[PDB]
Amino acid sequence: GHMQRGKVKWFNNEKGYGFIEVEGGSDVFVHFTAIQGFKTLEEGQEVSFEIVQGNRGPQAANVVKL
Template sequence: MAVGTVKWFNAEKGYGFIESPEGPDVFVHYSAIQAEGFRTLDEGDRVEFEITSGRDGRSQAADVKKVS
């Protein structure tokens, strides 16, 4: 699991980016957020996530969970 910080997230569009200390920013889609109800993230949230490869071959976050 990687740990990073939410750079930005647009709740209306359902996606954003996580700053990862392990490399370039990672795309995150709302469907990857592990939470009950409305799944969204706020700028500055600390999150744990898996890095996967999206359809276009770029890094994408999966199994995203907020951490304290």
């Protein structure tokens, strides 16, 4: 098994989604349901996560804060 690593580009805590920045690669969509932690995502937090293919494209899963 492996994981992706990056940092929260932005996360809107009213809307419930944002994107993760991956150095050299595409941003990855992240929904609030993908957050494994106690607290919500905030700009700049480094995260480990995996990418799953949703109906409308890739998105983050199992997002943990490093």
